Structure formats: structure tokens, C-alpha cells
Symmetry: C6
């Protein structure tokens, strides 16, 4: 990653064994559970494109997902090259060349080039641009691997309302519902999918009920 | 988080794998036991709003709780915007814009904006303001998930008084009794809920008994 | 805690996940075994009152003990306020206010106030004063939870003398015998409580015997 | 490894116990799974030739692989000496000698010589040159230890298409297919090797199908 | 402990959770095996008397040993006070007082006094003096807890000579034989205590045999 | 160990709990497997003679080996004293004395003397000289504890050639064959010791076969 030292210069530091192991272990334990993505984002704080490729490449399983992710990165790289075409022919001696999509993705750029871009005044944030592409790809993977439609999350007859709501919102998160839909589902599908006893209690609360109020009501 | 370096400047540092893992593991092991909240506060020392969202978003279960927490944050954001309305229209070039509730909560502000506020002379402490909102939300969750009324904590006939007192005060903590009530319960409900043999001994001590004296008495 | 940096200034640093976890785990594993107290003291090296409250508040069990500890802290705070009454009415602008007992205990003081006191020339050591109160409280808890009187530690007929002496001094430590009594018990209760075969051997050594000499004698 | 300090000088630092243990443990757990190679590359960030030999030499098993790796290094060293012959006879007093292949590989050079080369202005990057040779050798080992031809990865009749695609691309990675072949296999061998029900669905999609679209289709 | 910072000043740093836990765990796992003493010495590198008392006091078991250790420390403190008597009556204002035996042992001195002594030009090395006393005490404990005389370590009839030699020298180490005796036992008791078949082979080697040669001979 | 600080001075730092524990654990898990020696070398990076004795002394088992190691160190110390005799009689006031073999081995020198030598301009590298002696001793131990002659490593009739080659080269490493012999064994003993089916295939390859080619051939 790129970090600041005591002279006030942002400098390269090696990715730590602790970071490398944390990422491989969260993928081993959680696969493409939605909460893996904020973990990836946080473990890749300050990452160069080299560091992002290290993290993705240290994953041993899930090679279907990793091939889909490469396809997404290639789509984003291709859109970058459409928006930001680069001069053909020789670099000005000693000067910074403009990054292409494959430079951002770390496959045609050196670590030295990456550092040069990320530490330019002002930064050309190739690490942050590439991380955006990767997270776009990972979100597609999370949606693909979501096992269950929200339509099939219904409260069991002896299922505590809290356990049902946990399943419901775990499902909406993987299915990648907007916050607007998560906020609004409280006075639609969450009530419809409740068991008869709880649905009667929720129906009676009226509209405008907070989730806290609905959970209190069906305790 | 924001930390101080050797030039005397408060600077951004990445959230550590150790911090990320500590928080996910305490939620896995303890759920919304009351002691999770001081742990959250301490693990989020120096946190930006980005870091607070990372910690909450890395939680995989408990999505009912996480949706209630978003509802609380939205209520606090809305009260902030009532107290501190911001100018519409263009930012003064190169100058700091005033934060809105959604900027404090990290959903409409950049990490660079957050750093700018938190390191301003004097600080606009968006991390501390947002942490207050989050802890307000988490305290509601702790109360909601408290399984047992204090009225139902009664000393078993062969239950050591110490084990009963541990249950009693564990319950009052989750039910979120004020310190005044915790202090005063020693000469009310704690005696009433004691078994006959201990209640007789405590009744005789008189008023003014310390908890230490009551625990000694029923040893 | 408060630590020194490279300019020679004592500065605040966040409590570490390693410290937080060490303390919660020693309380989980050892409860109020006497050796928990030196561990608390060492894990709280440099602690602000905020940090001491974090450590105590991260404990999930033992709420009888934690309520007794609050009662002790309140007694010490009340004695502080007797010795060191503070001016009522407005703070001199920009100047340091004098701490009250509740400021020392971290319930009515800010982290900024605490730092101000602890880093004043010369320090007003609110962290060390509060730690003294807490350790006074924890020592009461250790004594309360000591399960066995020293009168009931007697050497079994096939019990190795060393195993008996370990039980004896483990008991005296929890019962909170002075060093004078621990030193002097070697030529009283330790011999009286020994089995017949060892008591005969120890009786014959004469007075003045070192513990090493008594342990050699009954090997 | 070579790291930068506060004066702006790249300096030697000891290889950490954490790095040493991480590498030995990944070889113990994963052997020559392809993902071991990016892990080796990342754990050896900044490595001197001495550090690379330490990492390889701390491996206890797999001595067939380690002997093949030495053979590869010797081939690369021999090609280096062809491209970059060095002066015979005495070093200019106090001056830097040119590295030979065995100096790059750390067997005939001192740590001091290695540091001298790696910190020269401009660097003679003996650590990076040697790491290239080692990774060339390790890639041969990965290919040798790949247990299964891609021709024998075929979707079972009740095998979820995703599990088949994971096996397929895990196999292509170990067999060390180019990215061009991995990209193009989606509209050849991946369909041919699918079960009848999925092959019918994929045959119908037409050409141009993304992996995401094929995986959606056979969900 | 006392460590050096960047201004070139030896400064106090808190004992680390890692150090505290390492020591408690080695005593839990190894008790008073001789190898515990070099571990104590190394874990207490740079220790103040306060830090040495922390380490000893964090031990929960072995209170017979810990009482013997206090007796040894008191003997050494008493000899210090014989060699180095201190002036009675008032300290020169702002000046360093001379340490007494109980100051060296940390029971009558403050951490500030200890730092003052250890960082004086030239140091009054109270940490190193106290560590010497403690190690003297711990060596007595190791000897006391040694279970077996060297006279009773004899090679079994089907016992590999190497396993016998390991037992022999493990025993001599706990019994606290000088290096002179360990060196010389190779051509006395080690041969006498060998089984008949090995004793015949060793008898024939002649005098002057290295341990390596004796171990080769009886392989 | 000796490390560099920010003023550009090589300074003493305490051996870390992580280093101490890593070494004791590798000896517990691997004994005198050959790969323990590069691990010792790497864990002792920068070590003073004091640190090397700490590491060897923290080993609890293997006291036959540790006594042989002392014998080797004494032989090397004696050869040092032959090559580098030191002046008898008084040190020049305030000046550096020349090290004797026992000073290099840390038994008659202080840590301060060791630091003085290792940080002299130019260094008298007592840590590196002593580490050489120790590794010479440890290599003898590895050879002594090697359980099996290379003559007895023969490919089983259903043993995969790769598993046989792993045994063969694991054995040559412990028996401490030169690299020349390891390189040349590929076209001698490795073929002779192969099973009939593989020997026929290898016999036919001709001379000049790489290990990779032989392993491919007998796959
Ligand atoms: O190296 C890796 N692992 C996952 C993605 N990448 C970068 C990449 C992107 C696109 C095609 C090929 C390689
Ligand atoms: O990102 C997260 N996780 C939990 C809360 N937040 C911030 C937030 C607040 C309110 C609505 C939407 C998002
Ligand atoms: O916060 C905590 N946990 C244990 C003690 N304290 C401080 C305190 C002291 C007294 C009353 C109320 C609170
Ligand atoms: O020391 C090691 N372990 C694996 C490779 N190397 C360096 C080397 C290269 C070639 C021949 C001999 C030694
Ligand atoms: O505090 C501890 N634990 C073990 C020794 N010490 C210091 C000490 C020495 C002698 C008498 C009393 C106390
Ligand atoms: O202290 C230790 N442990 C193993 C070797 N050494 C140093 C030494 C060398 C020779 C004789 C005596 C002691």
C-alpha cells in the first residue's frame, strides 16, 4: 500500500502477512456473503493495483467467480480506454505516461509506475479506480451466489419474529436491494411474509410503524 | 482512524486487520450483550465515519438489528439537519463545506472531506458525532434483545446469593436501568427477589447495607 | 493511554485490541483469583480514567463484583471531595478546572480534560489516583470470593508437602494476609496444619527454619 | 528485506518471524496449488537473495520440487552469465563488483554485497532478478503437480454448474493456460464438457455469452 | 522496561500484553523446568524492578515457590544493605536518594525513582541487580523441584543411547551441575550408567572420547 | 539483536517474545530436521552472543544435542584463541579489549562489550562469528540424527515416483550431501534405487536428463 512517513511523503510499504492471511481466511470462511465486500475494501486500504491483484490472486477456490471478476474488470478497462485514450509512441524522457485501463488493473504497469501515479501532485488514484472496478465485480458475484429470493423468506409458525427479520434482511442484502427498498419493505413484503399471528398484530399497528415498533409488537 | 505523527499533525491511518477481526469476533461471540457497546466504542477510537461504517458493514448476521440501527442513524441525521441547516449552491473554491447529517454518517461525504473536518482547527468532530448516534442505536438494540425482566430474576432455593446477584445486575444492565436504580435496588427489589433464608438475613441487616455487606451476610 | 512521542511530548494513544482482549480473557479464565489484580495494573499502564472505565465495562460477567466496585469507587470519590473541594461557578477562560471525585473516575470529565490533567506540568495524575481506587475495590472482591479459610488448609496424609504449601500460600494470598503474616506462618500455622509425619520432622528442625529448609525436610 | 527509514535511505531489516511462519505454513497447507505463488511473491516483498534462500530453505518437505527449483535457478544463472559476463581479477579498491548469476542467487555473494547492489543509485535489483528466476521455477512445479487434464473436467449429471466451472477454472489455472485461452474456453471446452441439460441451454444462448450469462442460464 | 527513543534518551515503555502473556504461559506449561529461567531473563530484558514484580505477581500457581523466592530476595536485600548503607534523614531537594535493598526489589521505591536510577549517568542498574537476586532464587527453586538424582538415570536395556543421554543431561541441568561436571561426566557416570552392551562399546573407545563419538559408537 | 535507529546508529533492541516463542516451537515441532538450521539463522538475524545463548538455553529437550553443541563451540573457541591470542594484563582505560573465544561465545563477555565490538567502526562481528560456530555444531547434530542411509531409500513397487524422489532428497539433505552430489545423483543412485518399471523408463531417457524430465517420464 501507499502510506505517509515522517518527512510528509506518501511511500510504498509491503502488504503485511496479517493483511494477506486476513483476506484469504475471510474468503475461506464466508465465501461471497455480502459482508466480505466491506472487509475487502478495508483490508485493501491504500492498495496499489499490484496489491489488489495480490489479494485476488492469493484466493485458491472460487475460480468461476475469479474468472467473472476478470470479465468485469476487462469491461471497465475498455470503458476507461473509451473515456481516456492515451498518446501512441514514445514517452517524454523522465516524464509520467498516462494510464490505460490495463495499467489501472496492474497487468501492463510496473509498481514504480503505480507509485508514480498515486503520489503525483495531484494523485492519479489508480488504486482507488481499480478498487471501484473490483467491487463492482464482487457485487455481481454476491448477487449471483445469493441462494434465495426474498419472496421465499416467510416466517415459520413457531419462528421468532426477530429470527425471521434477520433472514429477510440478510436475503435483501445478498439480492442487493437499494436502501430505499430495505427502508420501504417494513410496510409491505415484511408484513405479507410474516406468520398469521404476527401479521394480524402488524396489520393493526397501522402504517408508519418503525422496525423497532414492529419487532416490539411481535416479541 | 485519525492519529498524530512526529511533525505534530493528526493524520489518517488505515483501520488494522486486528481491529476489523476483533469487532467481527466480539459480535459473533457476544451478539448484543451490553458489554459489546464499550468494546465497539474502544475499537472505534479515532474512527472516521468511513471506519464506523466499515465496522458496522463487516457484520454478517443480525441484519434486523443493523436495519434498526440505520433507522436510528436516520432519525439523528434528520435532527442534525434541523439544528444545523447547510447553504444550498456552490462551495467557495478550495474551502470546507458544512456537514449535513448524511455527511456525518459517511454516506454522502468522502474520506477526504471527513479528514478535513476532523483535522480542522478547531475540529468538527464528525467521527465522534456519528459514534454518539451509533451508540444510541446500539443501546436500543441491547434493550430490545434483553431476554428477561428484572421482575423474573429471583434467587433459587439452593442458588448461592452471589450467583443470584450476578444474574440480577446482568439483567438490570441489559434492561438499561440508570446507575441511580442499580444503586437503590440493593434495598428493594434485590431483597424482595432473594430466597426466604437470605431475605430473612437481609431484612434483619436494616437499611443502609452495602452490597458487600449483603453478600457477606448471605455467604 | 498517555505515551511519549519523538518531540518529547506525552500524547494520547488508543487502547489496543491486544490490551482489550487480554483483559477480557484474563477475567474469563481466572475470575477474581488474586493474580488478576497485578495483571489489571500492568494492562492499564498509562491508562486515562476513560481507559480504566473501558476495561471494567468490557467485562460481561461478574456484575455483582462490578456493582461492589462502583460502590468502592463512590466511597473513594466522596473522600477525595472531602479532602479537595473545587470552586463552584465559572471556569477561568481557557484554563484547567480542578478535578472532583467523579472527574477522576471518568464519569463527569472528558477525555480532553483527563489528558489536560495527566500532561499538566506537573501532572495531576487522575489515571493513577483512579487506578488506586479501582485496585482497592478489586482487592475487596478478591477477599470476598476467596472460597476457603487458611484454618481449613491441612496436609492430606498422602499429600506431598510441596502441594500442601502451594494450597496454603494460594489461600493466604486470596484471604489477603500481610507479608509479615505470610513470612511468620512458616513457624506456626504451616507446621500445625501439616500431616503427622511431616509435623514430627518440622517440630524437630527447631525454630528459625527457612521455607526451603522445611520443604527439603518433608520432601 | 530492504525498506526505507526516516532519513530517506533504503535499509536492511531482518525477515520477521511472522513472514517466516506464514510461508512455511502456506507450503504445509497448500503445497504447490497455484495460489501459493502470488503468496510467495507478496511474502518476499523487498527480499534480498539471502531472504529468498531463507524462505526456500525453511521448507521441510517437497525436496523433489526444491531440487527441480535449484535446476531452474542454475539454468537462469547460466543465461545471466552469457548475457552479462564479469571482469576476472581484482576488484577496484572500495568499489562495487558486478554480479554473476550465483551472486544474484545468493550462493557466492554476501548480504553486504546484495545490499550494496539493491541500494546503488540506480539499483541493481538482484532481489527482483532472483525472484523472477524462482517464480519461473515454481510455475514449472505447479504445472508438474497439477493432477488433472482439463479434458477430464466434465460436469456431473447432478453437479451444480457453478461447482463444475470452479473445477474447470481451478484446473486451467494449475495446467497454466494463458488468459487468452481462459477467456476463450467459455465458448468451447466449457460448453462441450457440460452435462446434457446445461449443454442444451448453453448451445441455445448463442455465441458471445459472458461467463455470468452462462452461469445464470444453467443456475 | 527502559528503551531508547530517537533523541537518544532511554525512556520508560509499558510492559506489553505479549510479554505478560508469554511469561504466564511458560510458567503454566513448564513450571520450574530449568529452561524457564533463560526465558524469564529474556522476557525481562530492560525491566524495571516494578516490571520484575509484575511478572512474578502475575503467576497464579506455585505459591510455595513464590514464598521461597521472596525469602531469597530478602536475604539478598539484607546483604545489599550491609554493603551499601544509606544516609538517614532528609533527601537533598530535587536530588537522587541512594537505593536500599527494598528499593532495588521495588517494594519501597516508586517507578519514577527506579527510572531515575536506571537512566542516571552513569546508570545505577536497579533492574539488573534485582534480576540477579530473582534468578538466584529461581535457580534454588529449579534445584528443589528437580525430581530425580543423576545416580538414578540409567540406560534401559532397549533404550536408545541418545534417549538415555537426553535424560542424563536433562537431569544434570535441573540438579544444577557446573559445566566442568557436565563436560567430565562423559568419561565417568555417563558410561557407568549405560546398559551392558553400550558400556562394553564405550569402555573400548578409550579415554578422550567426544560425546559425538560415544553417541556414534552406541548408535 | 543490533538494529539501526533514525540518527543512523546501530543500537541494541531486546529479543522479542515472538522470536523466542518461534524458536522454541520450531525445535518442539521439527527437532533437528535440516530445515531447522536456516530457521535458526533467520530467527537470529542481528543477534548478539547473549541472544544466541538465550535461544539455545530456552530449549528444554534435546540436552544430548545441546551438550554436543557446547563441545563444538569449545573446539571453535580454542581454534579462535590459537589464531587470535589476546594481551594478558590491564585494559587501556576506556578502550575496547580484544575478544577471546569465550567472549565470542558470550560466556566471559558482557552485553555492553558485545555491543561495543558489533558497533565498532569497523565491526568486530562477534555475533556472526559465534553464529558460524553454532551452525557448524547444529549441522553435526542434523547428520547424527538423520535416521536413514541414502542406500536404503528405494522406490516401492506402487510408490509414486514423486513421493520416492521426495524421500530421496529429504534423506540426502539430512545426510548432508554436497550440492554437487545432489545434482549428480539424478543420473546414478536415484535411477538405481527406482522400482523396475520406472528404472526401465529412466534407463531409456539416456544421460543428461533433468530431474523435471525424469519426474515427467515416471509420472
Ligand atoms: O490478476 C488478477 N486476478 C483477478 C483479476 N486480475 C487482473 C486481471 C484482470 C483482467 C484479466 C486478467 C487479469
Ligand atoms: O453503512 C451502514 N451500515 C449501518 C449503518 N450505515 C450507514 C447508513 C445509515 C443510514 C442509512 C443507510 C446507511
Ligand atoms: O463505568 C464504570 N464501570 C465500573 C465502574 N465505573 C465508573 C463508575 C463508578 C461509580 C459509579 C458509576 C460508574
Ligand atoms: O538455497 C537454496 N534453496 C533452493 C535454491 N537455493 C539456491 C541454490 C540454487 C541453485 C543451486 C544451489 C542452491
Ligand atoms: O512482589 C513480589 N512477588 C515476588 C517477590 N516480590 C517482591 C517481594 C520480595 C520480598 C518480600 C515481599 C515482596
Ligand atoms: O549457553 C549455552 N547453551 C549452549 C551453548 N552455550 C554457550 C556455551 C558454550 C560452551 C560451553 C558452555 C556454554
Amino acid at each position: 500500500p501507499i502510506v505517509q512517513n515522517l518527512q510528509g511523503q506518501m511511500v510504498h510499504q509491503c502488504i503485511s502477512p496479517r493483511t494477506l492471511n486476513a483476506w484469504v481466511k475471510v474468503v475461506e470462511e464466508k465465501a461471497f456473503s455480502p459482508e466480505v465486500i466491506p472487509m475487502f475494501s478495508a483490508l485493501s486500504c491504500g492498495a496499489t493495483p499490484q496489491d489488489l491483484n495480490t489479494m485476488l490472486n492469493t484466493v485458491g477456490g472460487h475460480q468461476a467467480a475469479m474468472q467473472m471478476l476478470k470479465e468485469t474488470i476487462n469491461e471497465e478497462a475498455a470503458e476507461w480506454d473509451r473515456l481516456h485514450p492515451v498518446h501512441a509512441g514514445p514517452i517524454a524522457p523522465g516524464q509520467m505516461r498516462e494510464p490505460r485501463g490495463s495499467d489501472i488493473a496492474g497487468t501492463t504497469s510496473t509498481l514504480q509506475e503505480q507509485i508514480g501515479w498515486m503520489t503525483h501532485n495531484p494523485p492519479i488514484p489508480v488504486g482507488e479506480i481499480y478498487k471501484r472496478w473490483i467491487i463492482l465485480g464482487l457485487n455481481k458475484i454476491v448477487r449471483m451466489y445469493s441462494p434465495t429470493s426474498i419472496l421465499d423468506i416467510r416466517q415459520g409458525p413457531k419462528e421468532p419474529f426477530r429470527d425471521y427479520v434477520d433472514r429477510f434482511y440478510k436475503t435483501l442484502r445478498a439480492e442487493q436491494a437499494s436502501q430505499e427498498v430495505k427502508n420501504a419493505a417494513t410496510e409491505t413484503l415484511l408484513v405479507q411474509n410474516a406468520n398469521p399471528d404476527c401479521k394480524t398484530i402488524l396489520k393493526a399497528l397501522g402504517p408508519g410503524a418503525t422496525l423497532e415498533e414492529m419487532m416490539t409488537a411481535c416479541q
